[PDB]
């Protein structure tokens, strides 16, 4: 809980990714995850 | 007919987490990036750099949004152009065998975009932007950056020191799993 956004910013990119389709999917996944977290955070506000 | 002296290979083993056989394999990976620039005999102790453009386009880095920063951090002069020593050091730190405290230290350097020994709201803005390819709004980015500082700025100065960063990241269960390059 206490490092929710911190771990999203610093433990999200998988440095083993070496294919552009896999990379595209990961960017989409990360971005959607940030949006979900932002939605919950404003609700907490 | 040899790439290295025994002493040179002993020295690379001493300063990396690689076996002698791995140093040989990685040397050929480096030489193959620019075969008209990198000599095949390193007993001459050459002073040669592979340019960043060929490093960042390697299979192991080409899809990483932080590839330019990674090469900058490990390069001799901070411009991403790499000697053999720089290249070995980069893959050594990023290998699965590197200890977590060493990795956290270099992760800190990668994400400290302005190279001031701190991760501030501006450094965080760069990190979040690259992670989402600019698909969050500037306001959306600001919230994330502010939350990270709220969560992780332990000494309450508005920015992440190395100590702030290490306290946050050494807890994270997926740091070692994701901050890893295999070669
Ligand atoms: Mg900084
Ligand atoms: Mg601080």
Curated annotation (Swiss-Prot), chain A:
The modification Phosphoserine is found at residue 6. Changing residue 10 to R: Disrupts interaction with CIB2 and CIB3. Changing residue 21 to K: No impact on interaction with CIB2 and CIB3. It is found in: Cell membrane. Disruption phenotype: Knockout mice show reduced transduction current amplitudes in inner hair cells relative to wild-type. Changing residue 19 to K: No impact on interaction with CIB2 and CIB3. Residues 1-45 are cytoplasmic. It is linked to Defects in Tmc1 are the cause of the dominant deaf mutant Beethoven (BTH). Heterozygotes show progressive hair-cell degeneration from day 20 onwards, leading to severe depletion of inner hair cells and scattered loss of outer hair cells, and progressive loss of the Preyer reflex from around day 30. Homozygotes show almost complete degeneration of inner hair cells, and little or no Preyer reflex at any age. Belongs to the TMC family. Pore-forming subunit of the mechanotransducer (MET) non-selective cation channel complex located at the tips of stereocilia of cochlear hair cells and that mediates sensory transduction in the auditory system. The MET complex is composed of two dimeric pore-forming ion-conducting transmembrane TMC (TMC1 or TMC2) subunits, several auxiliary proteins including LHFPL5, TMIE, CIB2/3 and TOMT, the tip-link PCDH15, and possibly the PIEZO subunits. This is Transmembrane channel-like protein 1. The chain holds residues 303 to 347 of 757 of the full protein.
UniProtKB/Swiss-Prot annotation, chain B:
Keywords: Calcium, Magnesium, Metal-binding, Repeat. GO terms for biological process: calcium ion homeostasis. Residues 62-97, 99-134, 140-175 form the EF-hand domain. One of its GO terms (molecular function) is calcium ion binding. Ca(2+) 1 binds at residues 112, 114, 116, 118, 123. It comes from the Eukaryota. The keyword Nucleus does not apply. Ca(2+) 2 binds at residues 153, 155, 157, 159, 164. PROSITE patterns: EF_HAND_1, EF_HAND_2. The keyword Repeat applies. Acts a an auxiliary subunit of the sensory mechanoelectrical transduction (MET) channel in hair cells. Plays a role in regulating hair cell MET channel localization and function. The binding of either calcium or magnesium significantly increases the structural stability of the protein in comparison to apo-CIB (calcium- and magnesium-free form). Monomer and homodimer. Interacts with ITGA2B (via C-terminus cytoplasmic tail region); the interaction is stabilized/increased in a calcium and magnesium-dependent manner. Interacts with TMC1. This is Calcium and integrin-binding family member 3. The gene is CIB3.
């Amino acid at each position: 809980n206490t490092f929710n956004f911190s771990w999203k910013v610093f433990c999200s990119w998988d440095y083993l990714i070496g294919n552009p389709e896999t990379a595209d999917n990961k960017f989409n996944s990360i971005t959607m995850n940030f949006k979900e977290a932002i939605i919950e955070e404003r609700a907490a506000q | 007919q040899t790439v290295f002296t025994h002493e040179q290979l002993e020295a690379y083993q001493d300063c990396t987490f690689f076996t002698r056989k791995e140093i040989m394999r990685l040397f050929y990976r480096y030489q193959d990036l620019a075969p008209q620039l990198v000599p095949l005999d390193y007993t001459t102790c050459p002073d040669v750099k592979v340019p960043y453009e060929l490093i960042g386009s390697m299979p192991e880095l080409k899809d990483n949004p932080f590839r330019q920063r990674i090469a900058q951090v490990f390069s001799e002069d901070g411009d991403g152009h790499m000697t053999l020593d720089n290249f070995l050091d980069m893959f050594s730190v990023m290998s699965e065998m590197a200890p977590r405290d060493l990795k956290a230290y270099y992760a800190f350097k990668i994400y400290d975009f302005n190279n001031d020994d701190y991760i501030c709201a501006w450094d965080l803005e760069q990190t979040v932007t690259k992670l989402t390819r600019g698909e969050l709004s500037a306001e959306e980015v600001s919230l994330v950056c502010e939350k990270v500082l709220d969560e992780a700025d332990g000494d309450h100065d508005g920015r992440l020191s190395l100590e702030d960063f290490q306290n946050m990241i050494l807890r994270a269960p997926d740091f070692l799993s994701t901050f890893h390059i295999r070669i």
